[PDB]
Amino acid sequence: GCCSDPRCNMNNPDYC
């Protein structure tokens, strides 16, 4: 889950 990761969430607007 990309939403759980702060960096993933921030850099992946399509993912989360």
Distance CA 16, CA 12 (A): 6
> DSSP characters for 1-16?
-GGGSHHHHHH-TTT-
Distance CA 16, CA 7 (A): 10
Asked whether the CA dihedral 14, 6, 2, 4 is positive or negative, the reply is negative
Distance CA 1, CA 11 (A): 14
Query: What is the token pair recorded at 8?
Result: 């993933």
Q: Is residue 2 within 8 Å of 15, Cβ to Cβ?
A: yes
Which experiment gave this structure? NMR
Distance from the Cα of residue 4 to its chain's centroid: 7
Distance CA 4, CA 13 (A): 13
Q: Is residue 8 within 8 Å of 15, Cβ to Cβ?
A: yes
